[PDB]
Amino acid sequence: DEAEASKFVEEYDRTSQVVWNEYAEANWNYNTNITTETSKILLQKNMQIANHTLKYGTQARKFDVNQLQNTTIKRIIKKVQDLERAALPAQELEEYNKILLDMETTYSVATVCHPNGSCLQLEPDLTNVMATSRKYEDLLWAWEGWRDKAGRAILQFYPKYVELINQAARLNGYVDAGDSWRSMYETPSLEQDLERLFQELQPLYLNLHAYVRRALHRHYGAQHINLEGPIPAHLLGNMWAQTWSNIYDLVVPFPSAPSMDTTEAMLKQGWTPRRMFKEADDFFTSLGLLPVPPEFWNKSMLEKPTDGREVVCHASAWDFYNGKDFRIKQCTTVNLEDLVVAHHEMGHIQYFMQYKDLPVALREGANPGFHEAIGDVLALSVSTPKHLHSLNLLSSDEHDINFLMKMALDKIAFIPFSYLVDQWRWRVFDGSITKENYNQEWWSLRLKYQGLCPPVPRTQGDFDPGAKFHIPSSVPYIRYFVSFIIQFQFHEALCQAAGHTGPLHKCDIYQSKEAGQRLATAMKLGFSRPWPEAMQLITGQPNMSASAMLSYFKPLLDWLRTENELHGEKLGWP
Ligand SMILES: C[C@H](N[C@@H](CCc1ccccc1)C(=O)O)C(=O)N1CCC[C@H]1C(=O)O
Ligand SMILES: [Cl-]
Ligand SMILES: [Cl-]
Ligand SMILES: [Zn+2]
Helix, strand or coil, X not given: CHHHHHHHHHHHHHHHHHHHHHHHHHHHHHHCCXXXXXXXXXHHHHHHXXXXXXXXXXXXXXXXXXXXXXXXXXXXXXXXXXXXXXXXXXXXXXXXXXXXXXXXXXXXXXXXXXXXXXXXXXXXXXXHHHHHCCCHHHHHHHHHHHHHHHHHHHCCCHHHHHHHHHHHHHHCCCCCHHXXXXXXXXXXXXXXXXXXXXXXXXXXXHHHHHHHXXXXXXXXCCCXXXXXXXXXXXXXXXXXCCCCHHHHHHHCCCCCCCCCCHHHHHHHCCXXXXXXXXXXXXXXXXXXXXXXXXXXXXXXXXXXXXXXXXXXXXCEEEECCCCCCEEEECCCXXXXXXXXXXXXHXXXXXXXXXXXCCCHHHCCCCCHHHHHHHHHHHHHHHCCHHHHHHCCCCCCHHHHHXXXXXXXXXXXXXXXXXXXXXXXXXXXXXXXXXXXXXXXXXXXXXXXXXXXXXCCCCCCCCCHHHHCCCCCCCCCCHHHHHHHHHHHHHHHHHHHHCCCCCCHHHCCCCCCHHHHHHHHHHHXXXXXXXXXXXXXXXXXXXXXXXXXXXXXXXXXXXXXXXXXXXXXXXXXXX
16 A cells, blocks of 8 residues: 555645645735735635645545555654644634634734823834833833733633644544644653753753842832842843843943943944845855745835734744745844844744755654754854954953853743743643633743742733733744753854854854754754754754753853852742
8 A cells, every 4th residue: 555655645745735825825914914804814715724634634544654664654644644623623613713813813913002092012112111111110011001901802712722722632632732732842751851951951040030130129129129039020121021131231240341232233324124134144145054035035024014004023934835935024123132033033934945845744843943943043143242243233251241141131031931831831731720720820830930920910810821922823832942952052063063162152153064064954854854863963962952051151150150149149939
């Protein structure tokens, strides 16, 4: 029957390309122009792609994968047997698709208004307030307001969403949706592996947390900061306190060594969103990697539209499954934070182009984390003082500690948050957390892992998780935790291949062909082989390891311990 198998995969591939390309079209139109019309069309297309999935998935299940000889065919067919949402009865499928659409629309058009009439959208208004305001009450207004308008509005849809996504998972052979999502890593030991990694980063996070807590105590006052407790969630310069880069000014280790206004420098010399992506595109090509197609610059939405249409601003990279059309949709703002995001997204695009010739079923990253790490790796080099100086955006061991601190505020602060999100969802999916306890358990984890507390007590009806994009958008989050760990492993390996010597944090792989080759060879595998092989190709070993990230920040860890020790900090919280 081996003959029927290769034939099946061939038909699945050519037909999937057509249907998936049409779907991406409708999805893009909705995402870049939210209207009743584009919404209705997208929902119609959902039913069409579902019909295709059910047709080929039903056939795939007729094959006994065990008796299949060719490992590539065996792998593709096993994957096609998973119908995902298409496994749901037609009635539940349309209800599920509408719920997803409603949650996405609700989140993307939510606004927080003042008594007068001035209403602010998340991007860039509220994001700017959280990043620049140093007034406790103004930060509270934005923090609470976003949750009141976005979070609370998602609550009416979540319980049903959970019921339906779990039903689909069970109909595909999994115990629940969390089980289904975790399966993407093909790693039985996943939960234990990630827990060990999280634990290895505790010394660093706890020391950074204590140091930043002391700084906030200095700025906002003893009456608002408990030196032995959690930090109010609205003072970290970010709506979700997932990255603390924006309060660098309040915590700079050596204020005597001033650093240029990077964001002001970009604006000062006319940097634009297009320039930002052009620079990222240049970094990739410098490594010998692929440049984005001409079509990319013509079809991407790199700026928030001003023609009246409403859009999903949250940045994302798109593969239209025809090996030629790739696009990015981002409401880009001119600043260093979004420059890094630009590289992040361009990393996804590079992966798309690298595996474009593989069967559609295998056009995915070695694991989701790999897809998320590519752009971040290059951004690590872009963020170095020397590289920023080469871009004319910047002009001592102290400058070194300041830099590591800036890097830690983003990378280290994000570790517990990235770990937390799916620890919460997996327990919602497995029934451990009911709708009565959604919010309470979210905050229990926010405290346990991040050491944060809500500035305003939560009340019945609040659903703070809904105020975070990936929740109503139903996008898994553990990939970001994996990404932050492995991106440093990649940085370390690529730097070693590039001939770098000395402190790892001083490495800049710009123009390194050796580094480019390692990334390309790995990306070309797509999802054709277990991820340890792609890991081996890049790093020379097959496991995930926190050693690289710890090595990168070693100088900061030493500095933080000394600093916290002399101030008598009590690490942690009750
Ligand atoms: C800006 C970026 N966007 C997402 C998009 C996710 C997504 C998947 C499927 C459909 C729409 C959006 C991405 O990974 O590119 C993002 O959300 N990131 C990057 C790092 C951490 C995470 C965050 O900001 O929470
Ligand atoms: Cl929150
Ligand atoms: Cl994931
Ligand atoms: Zn990403």
